[PDB]
Motif scaffolding. Structure first.
Motif, PDB file in Angstrom:
ATOM      1  N   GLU A   1       0.681  -1.056  -0.003  1.00 34.04           N
ATOM      2  CA  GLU A   1       0.026  -0.051  -0.213  1.00 34.04           C
ATOM      3  C   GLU A   1       0.887   1.298  -0.093  1.00 34.04           C
TER       4      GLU A   1
ATOM      5  N   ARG B   1      -1.810   1.602  -3.095  1.00 34.88           N
ATOM      6  CA  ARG B   1      -1.898   0.949  -4.599  1.00 34.88           C
ATOM      7  C   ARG B   1      -3.473   1.136  -5.066  1.00 34.88           C
ATOM      8  N   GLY B   2      -4.145   1.984  -4.590  1.00 35.93           N
ATOM      9  CA  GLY B   2      -5.548   2.399  -5.141  1.00 35.93           C
ATOM     10  C   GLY B   2      -5.722   2.898  -6.561  1.00 35.93           C
TER      11      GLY B   2
ATOM     12  N   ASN C   1      -3.955   1.240   5.016  1.00 39.57           N
ATOM     13  CA  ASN C   1      -4.339   1.000   3.538  1.00 39.57           C
ATOM     14  C   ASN C   1      -5.215   2.339   2.997  1.00 39.57           C
ATOM     15  N   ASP C   2      -4.895   2.492   1.909  1.00 38.86           N
ATOM     16  CA  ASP C   2      -5.562   3.664   0.974  1.00 38.86           C
ATOM     17  C   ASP C   2      -6.977   3.127   0.516  1.00 38.86           C
TER      18      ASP C   2
ATOM     19  N   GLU D   1      -8.667   5.421  -4.765  1.00 43.75           N
ATOM     20  CA  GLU D   1      -8.695   5.217  -3.179  1.00 43.75           C
ATOM     21  C   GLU D   1      -8.240   6.448  -2.406  1.00 43.75           C
TER      22      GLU D   1
HETATM   23 CA   LIG Z   1      -5.507   0.082  -0.738  1.00 47.34          CA
END
Ligand SMILES: [Ca+2]
Ligand SMILES: C[N+](C)(C)CCOP(=O)(O)O
Ligand SMILES: C[N+](C)(C)CCOP(=O)(O)O
Ligand SMILES: C[N+](C)(C)CCOP(=O)(O)O
Ligand SMILES: [Ca+2]
Ligand SMILES: [Ca+2]
Ligand code: NA
Ligand code: NA
Ligand code: NA
Lengths: 142, 142, 142
Positions: B109, B111-112, B128-129, B116
């Motif tokens: 992360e 990695r959206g 986390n995104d 995101e």
């Molecule tokens: Ca993410």
């Protein structure tokens, strides 16, 4: 400055008032008593109080004693107090080392004969010397 | 005056102690974290925090991060943090606009891919995104 | 000194923020409203508020009135206010003796004809004159 100190004092009394009204704490003189409602042993209570920036509660006046008693009564459990037995049985000291002044022993207590180094408060406010491993209501003073 | 400041400081520590003991907040350095226990989206958390005179929580040190993680763990839910993605994907900023310094991304992360834009904290404290519309524990800093 | 006052003010806002976020109180101007959630009569509310270092709530502005109304709405109960009827029916005074300025009577009220010396707030915020012996939400101001 004087106007700033008033406002600060006013806001303090407001937050203390809110906490007081909602039963989150009891104020007696300059001392504030509070509990997290948990029942744990002596060592655990000690840690919890100090983590919160306080100390395991110890009454030094009749009014402080009744305050703690009311909390004990409210939660229907005995309370470990901030004192332990000396080397000489029957003699107890505060955690800083000073010998206990104010006492409120239940008649006949203490009589654990040096085997009961901690002190618990009954719900009527009187004291009993006891082992330090029981589950007791955690009450702190700030 | 000096006697008045002591009393004021004493009473502050008392109220902070009570709130701390009862799990109403966590104190880390000069920062205080707290939650109302509610799970709502990013915009809603933002409003709630500012209405209380604070801001949606954002950790800038490992100790602040662990503090928020413990709250996430306590309520068994992820926490939206006070940061959103820039125009360039993978770059995030605090809400004042400054680019993020301290990070604790879960491996891989963020990695959206720019889809995101919000950031959530897992219960182990890693980031986390994520999209900004999920229901997340509202944690504020004061 | 200036650095000490900042820290004190910062910590005050933190504790007020925590209490605010968790719905323990409402801040309106320099006035703080709070309830213990209990429903008791007028005399009992009076005592509870003063024991906490406050007074039975009384709105003097539309914003203060709406604040109390929201608490009444939250607990689904009417609220006794800090005012009682004079000797002349239809005339009410604050507890210090001063005649009431701001009012928000429900249309037609007060009309208890001197038999309803207390004042209750409906959940929509409007007032009704009432006997002082009913069970009402205890709301205090600090
Ligand atoms: Ca993410
Ligand atoms: C907890 N209690 C005091 C109500 C009864 C049990 O006490 P104890 O078994 O720890 O002596
Ligand atoms: C809320 N939760 C994290 C425990 C599981 C559901 O999360 P999500 O469906 O919003 O992604
Ligand atoms: C309490 N209540 C307002 C919801 C209904 C009962 O009120 P009252 O019987 O005291 O007049
Ligand atoms: Ca004994
Ligand atoms: Ca009426
Ligand atoms: Na003993
Ligand atoms: Na993204
Ligand atoms: Na009347």
């Amino acid at each position: 400055l004087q106007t700033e100190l008033y406002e600060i004092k006013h806001q303090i009394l407001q937050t203390m008032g809110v906490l007081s009204l909602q039963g989150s704490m009891l104020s007696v003189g300059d001392k504030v008593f509070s509990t997290n409602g948990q029942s744990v042993n002596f060592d655990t209570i000690k840690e919890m109080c100090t983590r919160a920036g306080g100390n395991i509660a110890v009454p030094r006046t009749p009014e402080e004693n009744e305050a703690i008693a009311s909390i004990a009564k409210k939660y229907n459990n005995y309370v470990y107090l901030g004192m332990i037995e000396d080397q000489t049985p029957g003699d107890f000291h505060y955690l800083d080392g000073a010998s206990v002044s104010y006492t409120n022993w239940y008649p006949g207590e203490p009589r654990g004969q040096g085997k009961e180094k901690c002190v618990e408060m009954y719900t009527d406010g009187t004291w009993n010397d006891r082992g330090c491993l029981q589950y007791r209501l955690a009450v702190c003073e700030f």
